[PDB]
Design a protein around this ligand. Structure first.
Ligand SMILES: Nc1ncnc2c1ncn2[C@@H]1O[C@H](COP(=O)(O)OP(=O)(O)OP(=O)(O)O)[C@@H](O)[C@H]1O
Ligand SMILES: Nc1ncnc2c1ncn2[C@@H]1O[C@H](COP(=O)(O)OP(=O)(O)OP(=O)(O)O)[C@@H](O)[C@H]1O
Ligand SMILES: Nc1ncnc2c1ncn2[C@@H]1O[C@H](COP(=O)(O)OP(=O)(O)OP(=O)(O)O)[C@@H](O)[C@H]1O
Ligand SMILES: Nc1ncnc2c1ncn2[C@@H]1O[C@H](COP(=O)(O)OP(=O)(O)OP(=O)(O)O)[C@@H](O)[C@H]1O
Ligand SMILES: Nc1ncnc2c1ncn2[C@@H]1O[C@H](COP(=O)(O)OP(=O)(O)O)[C@@H](O)[C@H]1O
Ligand SMILES: [Mg+2]
Ligand SMILES: [Mg+2]
Ligand SMILES: [Mg+2]
Ligand SMILES: [Mg+2]
Ligand SMILES: [Mg+2]
Lengths: 411, 209, 51, 413, 219, 298
């Protein structure tokens, strides 16, 4: 036919967080007292309406006799089996966990249209008969990596990176919201994105802000997560990872710290090195190998980039390489402005004192300065924060990086 | 019912035929040194009340060093006779092996077997093998060499771990090894061995003949 | 199994962890009833000076 | 001399500054997050409904027939038969997991069709043969017989006029003209390896011959050969090289055979042992006794240096087709492939673009064609200009290939 | 009763054993290396011993084993099974081979490509003992083999195989066969009816996958 | 709970009871049951170092609403460094005696064991077990092991040391930020641990331990000579001036060896002469011989 199987009958489950991200006074004002009490009004009413929903149900028929005997027809300890072959005379063959294979029948109310050798089924003990078929069959290691919560704030949280914010939006958000531009030129959007640069720059923030403002689902992978010891358990989890992402929504996958997943693919003398190297060679195959990909985007991030496998850096797999350099004397002002949002700031301070005088330090340095200067106010019994806090804080944070590089040869 | 346990996997416990094979007066004329080792091991094991009479906290470890053949291991064998301890002797060579991670776990396998047991003596035979950091290893398989010391320090003077564990080591020239080992509180005793001198050639010729 | 060189790769005290304990514990020092050992080999590169 | 905490001074802090709305705004946020929870367990609508048919058809079965198919129906098992003896059953039967029994035939069997090595339905109590079975087919080779056309024509593999010419000789020409090889007295090669830089077009030539094959074609997932159990991966090799002999002239495509074995060593006494057993089983069903006949093997790799010389021998892999970079005439043909289906200015030239990509692959050329349209969406256009492509070359290549030679260039003009 | 072949892996180890199965009628029994490895416990020693008891039932039967280094490895200690059934399949081979006296008629042939995997002290006396190494073809043995496989084609009679051995060096027997196959198809490109010395020279460069341009140094 | 054990009846496979104490066969080493350890006041002369640890550990646990009103994030990273024998491990045990909280002891070398992948993932299983005891303090012993440096590939450096290190680099700074869990790391060799966990998103407090002053060597000497019984006519300040830059931990070695001189005399009385002989015994030198090395390098 034209529309065979109507594409797996499957919906998508997106997140349930971000109930109301509008707390925009951002201070102790009565608006935020008024706004949150409105949220209290709707959720209490949603509680009381569903409380009335399970209350005022005088309908009892309980199966109209059909499913009730069926729930007694099946055994109460329902077991789990595995199909091997299909003998379609309502008497098929199965396989247990040990491999005990049984010429079982099909005790009914199961359509013989979604059962394939490999699909796990539901069995009995007294007669081992097929009662149902087990669905979704996910190994509970990939369901841990399914994010349900939008962790932090939106793009207005980070302190000015707008040239590279517009880059990642071209490949993730804009093709999903408005794919009318691309059909006018027939150009598929890019798939793979590398985030690379010095540490403490904003790599982990840029993934969390995308996972906040999105519509598809989200998957996180922490580095050495797909590494096991059973010599085939490594590459098998990678297949189920992209299988779940393909079966669900047109979603994106974030795999972080891929410097522990690739280094130039050399051959050597250790035997545990190869099951490392083999799992990382079939990720190459699932990504841009045989026929198709689907609508799955991959975002990858390291600190060092030159120690990677050149088979992963090539286009077709990753089409964007994004540098995150250390900041300037201009967008650094936006870093100090945002991290001093909700703190009592005395009018003696100048933000441009510490910016212009010293020209070396990351964005994660600036958050440590704002927290340390706040600790100095309680250290000398204060609420407001003056310049003398930042004089001691800019010292105490920066004394963790060594003295220098060479003497006055150059001039 | 609970059976009597065994803790029986990696047994080096020289106990009850055969630990001794030697008496205490067999060694010829190490009289400064027979008196010194006895103060740190044999004396606090029996007359523990003398240290509590002053508040001394008797010393933990002893480092012996000298030329190869001045009667070092014989002194360790002589303690094993006239003690009532669980003597454990370990060569310092079977944990510098391959299979990354097995080395530092064999250090844990000794002390978990020791601290579960009686007042015991842990005699590491030679650490004129790995005993010295003295550089940051920017190589491979040398930080595995370096980290066995780090595991040795963590279960020597890490937490309290106090009750009745004693460590004896024996080497050649001791200037090579780590200064982190040589702080007191970890390696309180330093004993040097001369070869003989005169009056000690007489004592060994007397006792052997 | 293979060859035995000096102290580089696995051409190490794997003999001498056993070997110095044999002449301690098999016979002689730790012994039973004047059993006699007869050493016989044609390779060795590394040996004990105390042997 | 710095200490500033004492329990009385704690009570200074949390009363100074907004004593009115501090807890008044806080516990509203606290109990609503409690109320986020208390809605969720009050819903409880998980509903993992599966197995059930539409409840309008099984009504006839689950009236009495389901109860009629509990006690008279059997939970019989399937087994295998070793042999038989004369004048009697004397049937010797194994399970390969359970024990080996010696049992009797039942009444419902014909004693002729109890041939050796046959799967048979066996009772649970007295273990009598009841129903013989059709033979077992391997379940995972059926999963990897492709049965599907990927749509790549040979007109998309431009820049490779001679590498296709070598590959046309081995695969396509004996399957359509098996005459001129015999009528001159030669034999075609049966194994072709593909090697070279990544992104050069290895997968394209394999994807395009799956289009125009008119034959059995088998993709093989490489890491299915590596298993958890000992000897299991070697058994998967055998079932692949048996069914290929059944039908005539089936194609087998391996891919990234670097993973399934590259070198045979043993110095630390161990390592990739089980991988070697699967890899050496592949060798003995490739050459040895019982030559295979009409089975063609294609392999492709990115790292051809680290492969076993047991596979480098001709007779197993006979033709070494390598892929290189297209010089200029290749690339000018590649730009006309990847940019014909996009809204461009109808007057631009492509030979100027093929200059500025000196050491580039077919993947890098397509990335320039996709990026140039992305600059048109940065502005508000619907057709690509010449400077759209010129900025795209600097974005793809010059942003990563050189940074010292472009500003400080004055050694070369 | 023990003959072992070894050498570089292109010399004709399997090619020699097929001819001995061809001309002799003495109940040839082929056996591969990784066939003895099975999944469940103790199945390989069943498969080792039953075939040897089968080959004892026939008097003249002789046994060939290919890739003995697939199991003939330096045995190492472990704690998670793994190899701790292979030695039970290995020692069963060692116990059976010393199980019978070396008389008639169950001579055993083995062949590996690398010697340094095998257990040398485990053979050593009355086990697999006779060393039959297969060196690379010297000069005329290359020119002989290239004449053997070129028996079935239209060769124009101005081709000296000694002139081919001048330029062909460090090849095994199979690469000498590969020159003979590729030269037939180069003449098929231009539709030539017979071969020439130039046709082999291009077939030589195709084996190690070379090609030539105008290199503008050479006038 | 998902991934939770239950009691299952063998009668009809009916559920019986939720079983707590989830699968974890390797918390024998972690969360030490008993703490009859040392006290808080016998540290003796590190008061600048001690009060900073109150600011990062006690203050966020006892009073979290201060950081709410002040409007900053709360710190969670502590690094302790210095020469050996300068009170690095007492301060772990002094906090653990008074924490009123869960204390998880991890030495820095058992994250290796022997098989790849399982030598890493228990670190991920370590910190997720700290979510059970929702306030917690986890301590590191001697990170001159894993946590050193991302070296090159090849058959050099080590991958698996880095494979474990990246998980430590990420369970406290990944997609999910943890709360009410604080880490303390203590080691020497400051410049050779890696510059990705030294960034101030990870470790907020770096605290030195210099060798003590002459006023500070006196106070250390008073703590360990407390139960020691001195006669009269004895000056500890003169003995404290006999240590030109002692470690502080070797003040005990003076205190033990001086009392040892009375033990061999069958005496309990300890004079000032017993200490002055014990100063020359404990304090030694490298004794660089032959002088040619010195004068090649004048
Ligand atoms: N541009 C920025 N604007 C605002 N905050 C920033 C910025 N860059 C970094 N930060 C601060 O840095 C922290 C995030 O760390 P970041 O995302 O840089 O980790 P990372 O890049 O993954 O580091 P590593 O590579 O070492 O893992 C946040 O707490 C945030 O406050
Ligand atoms: N000669 C070519 N002509 C046209 N397009 C090409 C050519 N070579 C590569 N491409 C384009 O590059 C993309 C990636 O190529 P492909 O992945 O097939 O290279 P590969 O050599 O198979 O990579 P790998 O070696 O990693 O398997 C293809 O989708 C194709 O569109
Ligand atoms: N001396 C020879 N005479 C004729 N043909 C040969 C000779 N040596 C090799 N060949 C050809 O080369 C091929 C290789 O021989 P064979 O199949 O025995 O491989 P092999 O050397 O046993 O490989 P391995 O040792 O790796 O199993 C044979 O098919 C044969 O046609
Ligand atoms: N200021 C001090 N006051 C009292 N005792 C101290 C002091 N400093 C060190 N010590 C003594 O040092 C020993 C503890 O060692 P410490 O806590 O310094 O570990 P460390 O030596 O820093 O660790 P490492 O050996 O790895 O350097 C204890 O015996 C303790 O009594
Ligand atoms: N002072 C001594 N008195 C008695 N026997 C000694 C003395 N010194 C050495 N020996 C003998 O010499 C041998 C030296 O053994 P050992 O102590 O292992 O050497 P090392 O001193 O290198 O450890 C001992 O077996 C011992 O019998
Ligand atoms: Mg990061
Ligand atoms: Mg000795
Ligand atoms: Mg490819
Ligand atoms: Mg062969
Ligand atoms: Mg310490």
């Amino acid at each position: 036919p034209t529309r065979v199987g109507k594409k797996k009958k499957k919906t998508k489950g997106p997140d349930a967080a971000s109930k109301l991200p509008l707390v925009t006074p951002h201070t102790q004002c009565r608006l935020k007292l008024l706004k949150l009490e409105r949220i209290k009004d709707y959720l209490l009413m949603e509680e009381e309406f569903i409380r009335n929903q399970e209350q005022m149900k005088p309908l009892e028929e309980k199966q109209e006799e059909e499913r009730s005997k069926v729930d007694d027809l099946r055994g109460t300890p329902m077991s789990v089996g595995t199909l091997e072959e299909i003998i379609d005379d309502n008497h098929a063959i199965v396989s247990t966990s040990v491999g005990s294979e049984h010429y079982v029948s099909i005790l009914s109310f199961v359509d013989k249209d979604l059962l394939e050798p490999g699909c796990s089924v539901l069995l009995n003990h007294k007669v081992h008969a097929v009662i149902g078929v087990l669905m979704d069959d996910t190994d509970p290691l990939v369901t841990v990596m399914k994010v349900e919560k939008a962790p932090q704030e939106t793009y207005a949280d980070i302190g000015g990176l707008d040239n590279q914010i517009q880059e990642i939006k071209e490949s993730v958000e804009l093709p999903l919201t408005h794919p009318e531009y691309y059909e006018e030129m027939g150009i598929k959007p890019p798939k793979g994105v590398i985030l690379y640069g010095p540490p403490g720059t904003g790599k982990t923030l840029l993934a969390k802000a995308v996972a906040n403002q999105t519509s598809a689902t989200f998957l996180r992978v922490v580095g050495s997560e797909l590494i096991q010891k059973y010599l085939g358990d490594g590459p098998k989890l990678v297949r189920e990872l992209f299988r779940v992402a393909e079966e669900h929504a047109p979603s994106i996958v974030f795999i972080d710290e891929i410097d522990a997943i690739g280094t130039k693919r050399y051959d050597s003398n250790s035997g545990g090195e190869r099951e490392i190297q083999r799992t990382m060679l079939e990720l190459l195959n699932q990504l841009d190998g045989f026929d198709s990909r689907g609508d799955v985007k991959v975002i990858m991030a390291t600190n060092r980039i030159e120690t990677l496998d050149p088979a992963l850096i090539r286009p077709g797999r990753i089409d964007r390489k994004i540098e995150f350099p250390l900041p300037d004397e201009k967008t650094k002002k936006r870093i100090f402005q945002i991290h001093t949002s909700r703190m009592t700031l005395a009018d003696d301070v100048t933000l441009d004192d510490l910016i212009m005088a010293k020209d070396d330090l990351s964005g994660a340095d600036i958050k440590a300065i704002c927290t340390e200067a706040g600790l100095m106010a309680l250290r000398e019994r204060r609420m407001k924060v003056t310049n003398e806090d930042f004089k001691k804080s800019k010292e105490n944070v920066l004394y963790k990086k060594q003295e220098g590089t060479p003497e006055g040869l150059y001039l | 019912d609970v059976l009597p346990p065994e803790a029986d996997s990696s047994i080096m416990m020289l106990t009850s035929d055969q630990k001794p094979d030697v008496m205490y007066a067999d060694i010829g004329g190490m009289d400064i040194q027979k008196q010194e080792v006895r103060e740190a091991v044999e004396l606090p094991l029996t007359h523990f009340e003398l240290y509590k009479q002053i508040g001394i906290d008797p010393p933990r470890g002893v480092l012996m060093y000298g030329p190869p053949g001045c009667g070092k291991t014989m002194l360790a064998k002589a303690v094993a006779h006239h003690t009532t301890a669980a003597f454990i002797r370990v060569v310092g060579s079977e944990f510098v092996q391959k299979y990354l991670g097995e080395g530092p776990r064999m250090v844990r396998d000794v002390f978990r077997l020791a601290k579960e047991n009686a007042p015991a003596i842990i005699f590491i035979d030679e650490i004129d093998a790995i005993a010295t950091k003295r550089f940051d290893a920017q190589t491979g398989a040398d930080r595995e060499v370096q980290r066995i010391l780090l595991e040795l320090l963590n279960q020597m003077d890490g937490f309290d771990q106090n009750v009745n564990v004693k460590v004896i080591m024996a080497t050649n020239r001791a200037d090579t090894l780590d200064p982190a080992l040589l702080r007191p509180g970890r390696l309180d005793r330093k004993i040097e061995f001369p070869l003989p001198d005169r009056r000690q050639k007489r004592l060994i010729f007397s006792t052997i003949t | 199994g293979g060859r035995r060189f000096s102290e580089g790769t696995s051409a190490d005290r794997e003999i001498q962890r056993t070997l110095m304990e044999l002449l301690n514990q098999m016979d002689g020092f730790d012994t039973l009833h004047r059993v006699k050992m007869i050493m016989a080999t044609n390779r060795p590169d590394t040996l004990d000076p105390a042997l | 001399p710095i200490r500033a905490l004492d329990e009385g001074d704690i009570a200074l802090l949390k009363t100074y500054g907004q004593s009115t709305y501090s807890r008044q705004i806080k516990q509203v946020e606290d109990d609503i997050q409690q109320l986020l929870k208390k809605i969720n367990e009050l819903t409880g609508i998980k509903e993992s409904d599966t197995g059930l048919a539409p409840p309008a058809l099984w009504d006839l079965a689950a009236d009495k027939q389901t109860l009629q198919s509990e006690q008279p129906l059997q939970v019989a098992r399937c087994t295998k038969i070793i042999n038989a003896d004369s004048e009697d059953p004397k049937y010797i039967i194994n399970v390969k997991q359970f024990a080996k029994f010696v049992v009797d035939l039942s009444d419902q069997v014909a004693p002729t069709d109890i041939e050796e090595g046959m799967r048979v339905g066996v009772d649970r109590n007295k273990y009598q043969i009841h129903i013989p079975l059709p033979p077992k087919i391997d379940p995972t080779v059926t999963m990897m017989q492709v049965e599907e056309k990927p749509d790549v024509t040979y007109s998309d593999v431009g820049g490779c006029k001679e590498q296709i010419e070598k590959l046309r000789e081995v695969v396509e020409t004996p399957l359509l003209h098996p005459e001129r090889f015999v009528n001159l007295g030669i034999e075609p090669p049966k194994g072709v390896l593909l090697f070279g830089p990544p992104g050069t077009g290895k997968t394209l030539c394999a994807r395009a011959v799956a289009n125009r094959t008119d034959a059995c074609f088998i993709r093989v997932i490489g890491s299915e050969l590596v298993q958890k159990y000992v000897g299991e991966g070697a058994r998967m090799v055998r079932e692949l090289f048996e069914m290929a002999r059944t039908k005539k002239a089936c194609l087998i495509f391996f891919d990234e055979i670097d993973a399934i074995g590259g070198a045979r060593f043993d110095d630390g006494a161990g390592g990739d042992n089980e991988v070697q057993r699967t890899m050496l089983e592949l060798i003995n069903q490739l050459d040895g006794f019982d030559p295979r006949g009409n089975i063609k093997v294609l392999m492709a790799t990115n790292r051809p240096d680290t492969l076993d010389p047991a596979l480098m021998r001709p007779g197993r892999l006979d033709r070494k087709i390598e892929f290189s970079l297209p010089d200029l005439e290749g690339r000018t043909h590649i730009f006309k492939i990847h940019a014909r289906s996009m809204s461009v200015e109808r007057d631009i030239r492509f030979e100027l673009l093929a200059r500025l990509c000196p050491n580039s692959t077919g993947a890098e050329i397509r990335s320039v064609c996709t990026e140039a349209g992305m600059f048109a969406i940065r502005a508000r256009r619907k057709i690509a200009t010449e400077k759209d492509f010129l900025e795209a070359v600097n974005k793809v290549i010059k942003s990563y290939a050189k940074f010292s030679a472009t500003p400080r260039y004055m050694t070369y003009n | 009763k023990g003959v072992l072949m070894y050498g570089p892996p292109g010399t004709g180890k399997t090619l020699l054993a097929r001819a001995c199965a061809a001309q002799t009628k003495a109940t040839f029994l082929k056996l591969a290396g990784p066939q003895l490895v099975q999944m469940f416990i103790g199945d390989g020693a069943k498969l080792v011993r039953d075939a040897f008891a089968l080959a004892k039932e026939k008097a003249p039967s002789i046994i060939f084993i290919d890739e003995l280094d697939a199991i003939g490895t330096k045995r190492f200690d472990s704690e998670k099974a793994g190899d701790r059934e292979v030695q039970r399949t290995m020692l069963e081979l060692l116990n059976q081979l010393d199980g019978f006296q070396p008389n008639t008629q169950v001579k055993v042939i083995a062949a590996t490509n690398r010697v340094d995997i095998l257990d040398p002290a485990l053979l050593r006396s009355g086990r697999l003992d006779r060393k039959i190494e297969f060196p690379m073809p010297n000069e005329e043995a290359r020119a002989r083999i290239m004449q053997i496989h070129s028996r079935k084609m239209n060769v124009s009679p101005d081709v000296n195989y000694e002139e081919l051995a001048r330029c062909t060096d460090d090849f095994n027997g199979a690469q000498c066969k590969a020159v003979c196959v590729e030269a037939g198809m180069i003449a098929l490109r231009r539709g030539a009816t017979e071969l020439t010395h130039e046709d082999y020279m291009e077939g030589i460069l195709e084996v190690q996958a070379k090609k030539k341009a105008n290199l503008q140094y050479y006038a | 709970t998902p991934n939770c054990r239950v009691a299952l009846r063998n009668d009809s496979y009916t559920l019986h009871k939720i079983l707590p104490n989830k699968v974890d066969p390797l918390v024998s080493l972690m969360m030490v049951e008993k703490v009859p350890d040392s006290t808080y006041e016998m540290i003796g002369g590190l008061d600048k170092q001690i009060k900073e640890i109150k600011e990062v550990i006690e203050l966020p646990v006892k009073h979290p609403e201060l950081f709410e009103a002040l409007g900053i994030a709360q710190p969670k990273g502590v690094l302790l460094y210095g020469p050996p024998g300068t009170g690095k491990t007492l301060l772990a045990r002094a906090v653990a005696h008074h924490t009123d909280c869960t204390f998880i002891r991890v030495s820095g070398s058992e994250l290796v064991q022997k098989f790849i992948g399982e030598g890493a993932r228990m670190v991920r299983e370590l910190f997720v077990m700290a979510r059970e005891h929702a306030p917690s303090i986890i301590f590191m012993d001697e990170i001159d092991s894993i946590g050193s440096s991302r070296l090159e590939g090849g058959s050099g450096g080590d991958s698996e040391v880095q494979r474990t290190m990246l998980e430590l680099l990420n369970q406290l700074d990944g997609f999910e930020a943890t709360k009410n869990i604080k880490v303390i790391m203590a080691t020497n060799r400051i410049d050779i641990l890696d510059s990705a966990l030294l960034r101030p998103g990870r470790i907020d407090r770096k605290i030195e331990f210099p060798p003590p002053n002459e006023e500070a060597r006196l106070d250390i000497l008073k703590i360990h000579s407390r139960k020691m019984n001195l006669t009269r006519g004895i000056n500890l300040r003169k003995i404290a001036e006999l240590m030109p830059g002692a470690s502080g931990a070797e003040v005990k070695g003076v205190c033990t060896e001086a009392g040892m001189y009375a033990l061999r005399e069958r005496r309990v009385h300890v004079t000032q002469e017993d200490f002055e002989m014990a100063v020359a015994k404990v304090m030694q030198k490298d004794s660089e011989k032959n002088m040619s090395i010195k004068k090649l390098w004048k």
